[PDB]
Amino acid sequence: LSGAVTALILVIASVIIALVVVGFAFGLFGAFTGQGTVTQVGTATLSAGTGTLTVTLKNTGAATQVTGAIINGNAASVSGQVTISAGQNTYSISLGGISSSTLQNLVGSTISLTLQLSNGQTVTVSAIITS
């Protein structure tokens, strides 16, 4: 009599476990699709006198936040409007840890930027240097 009881106990347990795994997979699907996608729209004028980006990031997910930036192969620090709101907006972020002598000489030229986002993906930014 033990064989049948064991069979049904294991069958019910397997049904429960399979349902749990399938539900977890679908929940992971939902979590990943709305994970937060951030891209660059338009240019990003960068000031050289003090250092203040004017990037225009368009995000279609969770309200993430920038955690850092890379300038000339150096780890910078970001302060300002650091909280990335949902929806396309004009953001005024301020960089840090750059000497105001190298960047000042490049007024009117273009460089390439990267923002260190909190959801694990970086965004490449093209910039115009301005006074």
Numbering used by the authors: 13 to 143
Task: Quote the authors verbatim.
The cells grown in rich medium (MTSVY), produced a single variety of T4P which were very similar to the adhesive Aap pili previously reported for S. islandicus LAL14/16, with a slightly improved resolution (3.9 Å versus 4.1 Å). We denote this type of T4P as mono-pilus (see below). The mono-pilus has an asymmetrical unit containing a single pilin with a helical rise of ~4.95 Å and a helical rotation of ~104.8°, displaying a slightly right-handed 7-start feature, similar to the Aap pilus of S. islandicus LAL14/1. The REY15A mono-pilus structure adopts the known archaeal T4P two-domain fold, featuring a long N-terminal α-helix and a C-terminal globular Ig-like β-strand-rich domain. In the mono-pilus, the inner helix of a mono-pilin S0 interacts with outer domains from pilins S+4, S+7, and S+11, resulting in a total buried surface of approximately 873 Å2. In the mono-pilus, the outer domains are densely packed. The outer domain of S0 interacts with six other outer domains, exhibiting an extensive total buried surface area of 1,574 Å2. Three out of those six interfaces are unique (with the other three related by symmetry), with buried surface area ranging from 236 to 300 Å2. Previous work has demonstrated that a closely related mono-pilus exhibits remarkable stability under extremely harsh conditions, such as boiling in GuCl or pepsin digestion. This can be attributed to the fact that the inner hydrophobic helices of the mono-pilus are completely encased by the outer domains, which are further armored by heavy glycosylation. Under conditions of nutrient limitation, S. islandicus REY15A cells predominantly express tri-pili, although mono-pili and flagella are also present at low levels; however, in the rich medium, the cells exclusively express the mono-pilus.
Type IV pili (T4P) represent one of the most common varieties of surface appendages in archaea. These filaments, assembled from small pilin proteins, can be many microns long and serve diverse functions, including adhesion, biofilm formation, motility, and intercellular communication. In this study, we present the high-resolution cryo-EM structures of the Saccharolobus islandicus REY15A mono-pilus and tri-pilus and demonstrate that archaeal type IV pilins can also polymerize into dramatically different filament structures.
